[PDB]
Amino acid sequence: IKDMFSSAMEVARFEGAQIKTVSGIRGEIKRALSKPEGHYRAAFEDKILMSDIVILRSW
Amino acid sequence: QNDLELQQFLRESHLLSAFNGIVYQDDQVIGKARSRTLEMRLNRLSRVNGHQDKINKLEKVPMHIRRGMIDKHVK
Amino acid sequence: FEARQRIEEKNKESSDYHAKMAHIVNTINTEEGAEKNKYERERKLR
Amino acid sequence: MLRRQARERREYLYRKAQELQDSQLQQKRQIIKQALAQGKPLPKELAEDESLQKDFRYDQSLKQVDDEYAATSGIMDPRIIVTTSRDPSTRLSQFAKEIKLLFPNAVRLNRGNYVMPNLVDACKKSGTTDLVVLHEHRGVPTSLTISHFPHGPTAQFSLHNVVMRHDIINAGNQSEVNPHLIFDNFTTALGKRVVCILKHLFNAGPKKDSERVITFANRGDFISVRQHVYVRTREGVEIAEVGPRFEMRLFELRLGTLENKDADVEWQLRRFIRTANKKDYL
Amino acid sequence: FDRTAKPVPVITSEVTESLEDMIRRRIQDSNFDDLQRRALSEELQKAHSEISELYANLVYKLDVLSSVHFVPKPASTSLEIRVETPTISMEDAQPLYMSNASSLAPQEI
Amino acid sequence: LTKCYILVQGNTVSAMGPFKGLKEVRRVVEDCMKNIHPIYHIKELMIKRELAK
Amino acid sequence: RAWDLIRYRNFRTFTGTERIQFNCLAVDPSGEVVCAGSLDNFDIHVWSVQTGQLLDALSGHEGPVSCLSFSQENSVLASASWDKTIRIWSIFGRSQQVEPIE
Amino acid sequence: VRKLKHHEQKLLKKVDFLEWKQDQGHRDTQVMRTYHIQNREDYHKYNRICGDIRRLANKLSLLPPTDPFRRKHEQLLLDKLYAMGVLTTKSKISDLENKVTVSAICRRRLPVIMHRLKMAETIQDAVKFIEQGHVRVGPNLINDPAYLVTRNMEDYVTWVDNSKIKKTLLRYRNQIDDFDFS
């Protein structure tokens, strides 16, 4: 997942959070990728598409 | 009146004497007494909630020999 | 650390709320349906 | 024995489907059993069917370890292979050494160029009972899969806080005597299933003074595995820690061997459901 | 934000201490979850004898019908009395013999 | 229970059997003509058989 | 089962644990061990003769063990089965060695 | 035989030249048509054995329900018939009266085993093939249709090598290796 964070520190702050696509596919962020900074690895209920947007509902 | 073994012995005293000290308690009752005793108990339990046209089904006997059976039994 | 603490406090809050709502539902059921059935029983005599 | 084992699994799952299909007759035969026991009247459904009572004359003489392990529970000792993933690192080879020292009646097999279908076939015709496949991540071992072989279950676990006996110190040699077991709060039916899986790979009947013990203690779906030796003093019992300690978490349990992944799943970790983190042995 | 699952537990000295004294309680009470190594009546007697001879004849013809691939009877640690006698006398009727010992050993006499 | 053959006829009770059975049926019949019910004696006869064996 | 041909007594009886029927056997030259194979079990059952116990169950055939024979001189076991395979077992002395000839 | 009129059919009702009451509904004929049984007396040779099993099962259910003799022999007979293949489940003892049946002993015959193993397209084809001598169980060729195949002995029902049927199935999938003759 590309750009909801600006740094791996930010993703480290937000690890384990539950996200979802706009299709309601639930998911969880797992680990920040190393070289592209705000990019991370998430796991979903099944295969999401390239035309989706993930969402971290915070308050 | 709420003794179960005593009242079971009372109403199965007849076929124990027909198909036999004596034994009356289950875990000692050998064949035809056991089959008819268990069948009598199951009939008496099932006659409360089961329908009266469905609990006591007669064996299909033809007319002219069931009537002769009844006449000789009444004799 | 905040993960474990927030998850377990949310679980505690949900398990308290379900007990509270089920309690008020069946207290309204029992100690007012007894009076509903009592009124029906003393209305069947008429 | 290909055809024998295929048709034997076929007949077993036919009998299991027939049991769950005609398991209503077991409990309504139980109802008329206790109706004979205390002389209480029998329901309408059990009162008007005449065939069930004249089968009950025959069926009045009817009346822990489960269906895969039940045939040879204490009769025969297990036989375990311990193998790594493929081209393993040296710390995974040390960990596989430690797991083959954990389980008695376990040997270790070098893994490389072994396909998992013909590995499973070679094991289940050479007579082994269990296969433990270990997976790593840059040294740190991350999974172990236990497959019970006469078409038994596979339980797949992840391993989490792994400290190794090779990693600590030269504290000596291990004991290798038949250990005692400890299972702490395995309370659900999945808990008893996982207990039977994890404990039918130890030898039946250790000595009463067998001085090593190994504990599988459940702490919210995180089975802490430690291994201890002991010597009972005048005032308590003194515990020394020996051999590896980790936490295994069951994420999958299916009902075939390792090769297919077409087997029916008995349990697997629903992670993304809405009420995921609210119950244990979920 | 809400989070999906509980994190993996950190193993500290308190949880190792609690786990060790659990093990100590079990190990001083020997609460170990190990694997464990695996005449009547006249009428009842004659009922038993009748179904025994029925069972014998039926098993014989089931084996012959099955073309004697069957699965054997389970186990019977029976009890045999042998008297002592010459093994000449334990033989068949023919002019010869094979051994003139006695059927009981010296340590059986 | 008593291994006897009993005929309740008219205003008397005939009985054939062994002497222990005859003693038992005589006490049963006389206490049944007094007010205590005979199924109490049948119950104590069953109790005494399973207590004597 | 074993038969003394002096005192005419069946002094030994060997069963398995699986309730199978045995179709062929083979004894040691130095008759410590009897060995027997079935046509429904794919294993070979190895009993001591001095004690009565089941010493081993050799496994590795994938077909019913049709025939057994011990070599009379070097005491190596040869079994052969309907999986098109003859197999040579070195039982004695720390080997537990198996050589399958297809 | 001539479709009696109303006065005749009223006057002689019990007349039937085909179906009698001793026939038992022609069930020997019916199940020997189902499982393609050659000789007439195989039904009744199996019916004697079903009557043996059910006579023992009656006389064994007439024992008291808790004694170990009844429980041991009921379980032992149940295990023997399941292993032979007549019974399909060793769970309940009412199978020893209800589910023991000449059709179950006939489903265990060699052509029916064949047809269920997809080794022949019908039971009559399986009869023709094992009469023509294509089928061996184990090593030895089986030649008669009535051969009863137990559960462990149905793993070895194959064709003989050098069978034309074995050759044409191998050459249908062109896996025929002519080194081992097929």
How far off is chain E from G33, nearest CA to CA, in Å? 22
- Partner-chain residue, chosen from E47, E51, E62, that has the shortest CB–CB distance to H84: E62
Contacts of D217 (CB under 8 A, 6+ apart): D182, D183, D184, D185, D223, D224, D226, E19, E22
For residue E17, the chain D residue with the least C-alpha distance is D239
CA–CA gap between residue D193 and residue D184 (Å, rounded) = 14
Tokens 């464990």: give the residue: E36
SS (H, E, C) A6-54: CCHHHHHHCCCEEEEECCCCEEEEEEECCCCCCCEEEEECCCCCCCCCE
- Strand, helix or coil at H136? strand
Q: What is the DSSP letter of H25?
A: G
For residue A44, the chain E residue with the least C-alpha distance is E4
Token duo for residue H112: 């029916």
**Residue count (chain H):** 182
Token duo for residue D5: 């084992």
Set of chain B residues whose Cβ sits within 8 Å of the Cβ of E44: 28, 30
CA–CA gap between residue F12 and residue F8 (Å, rounded) = 6
CB G44 within 8 A of CB G37: yes
Mark residue H64 as left, alpha or beta (left: phi above 0; alpha: psi -120 to 50; beta: remaining). beta
Token duo for residue G9: 């007594």
Set of chain A residues whose Cβ sits within 8 Å of the Cβ of E6: none
From the candidates D278, D279, D280, D282, which should be mutated to test the interface with C, based on the most C CB atoms within 10 A? Answer: D278
Provide the strand spans (E) within E6-71. none
Amino acid at C27: T
Contacts of D173 (CB under 8 A, 6+ apart): none
Contact call for H56 and E55, based on CB within 8 A: yes
CB D136 within 8 A of CB D88: yes
Closest CA to G60 of G29, G90, G93: G90
Question: What is the distance of C-alpha B1 from the center of its chain?
Answer: 20
CA–CA gap between residue E94 and residue A36 (Å, rounded) = 102
CA–CA gap between residue H84 and residue E69 (Å, rounded) = 9
CB G37 within 8 A of CB G79: yes
Closest CA to G22 of H28, E68, H105, H120: E68
Token duo for residue B3: 């003794």
CB contact, 8 Å: H22 with chain B?
no
Cβ-count burial of C39 within 10 angstroms (0-12 exposed, 13-18 middle, 19+ buried)? exposed
* DSSP3 helix / strand / coil % (chain G, rounded to 5): 0, 50, 50
Tokens 């094979």: give the residue: E98
From the candidates H62, H67, H97, which should be mutated to test the interface with B, based on the most B CB atoms within 10 A? Answer: H62
- Partner-chain residue, chosen from E71, E75, E101, that has the shortest CB–CB distance to G7: E101
For residue E38, the chain G residue with the least C-alpha distance is G17
Sheet-wide strand order for H135-137: H140-141, H135-137, H157-159
CA–CA gap between residue H79 and residue H93 (Å, rounded) = 11
- Strand, helix or coil at B55? helix
Token duo for residue B27: 């875990």
Question: What is the distance of C-alpha D43 from the center of its chain?
Answer: 41
Closest CA to D58 of B28, H88, H94, E51: H94
CB atoms under 10 Å from CB of D234, counted, come to 4
For residue E5, the chain A residue with the least C-alpha distance is A16
Q: Rounded to 10 degrees, what is the CA torsion of B61, B64, B69, B75?
A: 160
From the candidates A18, A23, A44, A54, which should be mutated to test the interface with D, based on the most D CB atoms within 10 A? Answer: A18
Contact call for E105 and G19, based on CB within 8 A: no
Which DSSP string do the residues of chain D spell out, in sequence order? -HHHHHHHHHHHHHHHHHHHHTTHHHHHHHHHHHHHHTT-PPPSHHHH-HHHHHHHHHHTT-----TTTSTTTTTS---EEEEESSS--HHHHHHHHHHHHHSTTEEE---SS--HHHHHHHHHHHT--EEEEEEEETTEEEEEEEEETTT--EEEEEE-S-B-HHHH--------S--EEEEE---SHHHHHHHHHHHTTS-S---TT--EEEEEEESSS-EEEEEEEEE--SSS-EEEE-S-BEEEEEEEEESS-SS-S-SPEEEE---SSTTGGG-S--
CB H35 within 8 A of CB H112: yes
CA dihedral (H74, H75, H81, H85) positive or negative: positive
CA–CA gap between residue D6 and residue H175 (Å, rounded) = 23
Question: What is the distance of C-alpha D92 from the center of its chain?
Answer: 23
- Partner-chain residue, chosen from H59, H62, H66, that has the shortest CB–CB distance to B27: H66
For residue C6, the chain E residue with the least C-alpha distance is E2
CB D206 within 8 A of CB D134: no
Contact call for D61 and H71, based on CB within 8 A: yes
CA–CA gap between residue H136 and residue H143 (Å, rounded) = 8
CB contact, 8 Å: H138 with chain G?
yes
From the candidates G19, G59, G83, which should be mutated to test the interface with D, based on the most D CB atoms within 10 A? Answer: G59
Which DSSP string do the residues of H44-70 spell out, in sequence order? HHHHHHHHHHHHHHHHHHTS-TT-HHH
Token duo for residue E40: 């009547």
Contact call for E1 and A28, based on CB within 8 A: no
- Strand, helix or coil at C4? helix
CA-to-CA separations, F22 to B13, F26, F52, G71, in angstroms, rounded: 19, 6, 18, 84
CB contact, 8 Å: D16 with chain H?
no
Tokens 């199940």: give the residue: H31
Range D163-170, long-range pairs (CB < 8 A, 24+ positions) = D163/D244, D163/D245, D163/D246, D164/D91, D164/D94, D164/D95, D164/D98, D164/D244, D165/D98, D165/D242, D165/D243, D165/D244, D166/D91, D166/D94, D166/D95, D166/D97, D166/D98, D167/D94
Tokens 């079971």: give the residue: B8
Mark residue A23 as left, alpha or beta (left: phi above 0; alpha: psi -120 to 50; beta: remaining). alpha
CA-to-CA separations, E2 to B55, C2, D244, D278, in angstroms, rounded: 63, 10, 35, 13
CA–CA gap between residue D52 and residue D35 (Å, rounded) = 14
Amino acid at B26: D
Contacts of D99 (CB under 8 A, 6+ apart): D82, D106, D132, D134, D144, D244
- Partner-chain residue, chosen from D36, D47, D54, that has the shortest CB–CB distance to B41: D36
Q: In the structure, do chain C and chain B come into contact, i.e. share 3 or more CB pairs under 8 Å?
A: no
CB A26 within 8 A of CB A43: no
- Partner-chain residue, chosen from B3, B21, B24, that has the shortest CB–CB distance to F43: B3
The number of C-beta contacts closer than 8 angstroms across E and G is 30
CA–CA gap between residue D149 and residue G41 (Å, rounded) = 16
CA-to-CA separations, B73 to A7, B13, E7, in angstroms, rounded: 103, 21, 85
Cα angle at G36 between G33 and G37, to 5 degrees?
150
Burial E35-65 (b: 16+ CB within 10 A, else e): beeeeeeeebeebbeebeebbeebbeebeeb
CB contact, 8 Å: E29 with chain B?
no
Contact call for B31 and E44, based on CB within 8 A: no
Tokens 């690890």: give the residue: A15
Token duo for residue D16: 């299991």
Range E47-53, long-range pairs (CB < 8 A, 24+ positions) = E47/B30, E47/B31, E47/H59, E47/H62, E47/H63, E48/H63, E48/H69, E50/H59, E51/H56, E51/H59, E51/H60, E51/H63, E51/H69, E51/H73
Contact call for G40 and H152, based on CB within 8 A: yes
Subunits next to B (3 or more Cβ pairs <8 Å) are: D, E, F, H
CA–CA gap between residue B37 and residue D57 (Å, rounded) = 11
CB contact, 8 Å: B21 with chain E?
no
Closest CA to D74 of E74, E76, G17, G58: G17
Contacts of D143 (CB under 8 A, 6+ apart): D134, D135, D156, D157, D158, D159
CA–CA gap between residue H182 and residue H165 (Å, rounded) = 10
Q: Which helix (H) or strand (E) holds G87?
A: strand G85-90
Set of chain B residues whose Cβ sits within 8 Å of the Cβ of D53: 39, 42, 46
- Partner-chain residue, chosen from D2, D76, D126, that has the shortest CB–CB distance to G60: D126
CA–CA gap between residue D32 and residue D41 (Å, rounded) = 9
Contact call for E23 and D239, based on CB within 8 A: yes
Resolution in A: 3.2
CB D146 within 8 A of CB D95: no
Burial G16-35 (b: 16+ CB within 10 A, else e): bebebebbbbbbbeeeebbb
Burial D178-208 (b: 16+ CB within 10 A, else e): bbbbbbbebeeebbebbbbbbbbbbbbebee
**Going by DSSP bridges, is the β-strand pair D238-241/D265-268 parallel, antiparallel, or unpaired?**
unpaired
CA–CA gap between residue E104 and residue E86 (Å, rounded) = 9
Set of chain E residues whose Cβ sits within 8 Å of the Cβ of A58: 1
Set of chain E residues whose Cβ sits within 8 Å of the Cβ of D157: none
CB contact, 8 Å: C41 with chain E?
no
Closest CA to G61 of G18, G100, G16: G100
Closest CA to D136 of D174, D83, D100: D83
CB H120 within 8 A of CB H104: no
Amino acid at E43: E
Question: What is the distance of C-alpha G8 from the center of its chain?
Answer: 24
- CA atoms lying within 13 Å on the CB side of residue A55: 11
CA–CA gap between residue D181 and residue D192 (Å, rounded) = 14
CA-to-CA separations, C6 to D160, D277, H174, in angstroms, rounded: 22, 11, 66
- CA atoms lying within 13 Å on the CB side of residue B19: 14
CA–CA gap between residue B45 and residue B48 (Å, rounded) = 7
Token duo for residue E52: 């025994």
Tokens 């061997």: give the residue: D257
Question: E91 phi and psi, to 5 degrees?
Answer: -115, -170
Contacts of D234 (CB under 8 A, 6+ apart): none
CB atoms under 10 Å from CB of E72, counted, come to 11
CB contact, 8 Å: B10 with chain F?
yes
CB contact, 8 Å: D11 with chain H?
yes
Closest CA to D80 of D102, D64, D113: D102
CA–CA gap between residue E39 and residue D242 (Å, rounded) = 58
Cα angle at H42 between H41 and H48, to 5 degrees?
95
Q: Which helix (H) or strand (E) holds B41?
A: helix B31-46
CA–CA gap between residue G16 and residue D253 (Å, rounded) = 33
CB atoms under 10 Å from CB of H103, counted, come to 18
CB H137 within 8 A of CB H97: no
**Residue count (chain G):** 102
Q: Which helix (H) or strand (E) holds B38?
A: helix B31-46
**Residue count (chain F):** 53
First to last CA, chain A: 21
CA–CA gap between residue D6 and residue D257 (Å, rounded) = 12
CB atoms under 10 Å from CB of D83, counted, come to 22
Q: Which helix (H) or strand (E) holds H159?
A: strand H157-159
CA-to-CA separations, H3 to C13, H6, H10, H17, in angstroms, rounded: 86, 9, 12, 12
**Residue count (chain C):** 46
CB D196 within 8 A of CB D66: yes
**Going by DSSP bridges, is the β-strand pair D130-137/D80-84 parallel, antiparallel, or unpaired?**
parallel
CB atoms under 10 Å from CB of E1, counted, come to 14
Cβ-count burial of H140 within 10 angstroms (0-12 exposed, 13-18 middle, 19+ buried)? exposed
CB D254 within 8 A of CB D262: no
Contact call for D219 and E9, based on CB within 8 A: yes
CB E75 within 8 A of CB H70: no
Which residues on adjacent β-strands are paired with residue G25? G36
Cα angle at E87 between E83 and E88, to 5 degrees?
130
How far off is chain D from E17, nearest CA to CA, in Å? 11
| DSSP alpha helix (H) spans, chain H | 6-11, 27-34, 42-61, 68-84, 102-107, 110-116, 123-132, 164-172
CA–CA gap between residue D136 and residue D144 (Å, rounded) = 9
Burial G49-71 (b: 16+ CB within 10 A, else e): beeeeebbebbbbbbbbbebebe
Tokens 């399958």: give the residue: G100
Token duo for residue D102: 């954990």
Q: Which helix (H) or strand (E) holds G55?
A: strand G54-58
- Strand, helix or coil at B73? helix
Q: Rounded to 10 degrees, what is the CA torsion of B11, B14, B19, B20?
A: 90
Amino acid at H161: D
Q: Kindly calculate the radius of gyration of chain F based on its CA atoms and give it in whole angstroms.
A: 11
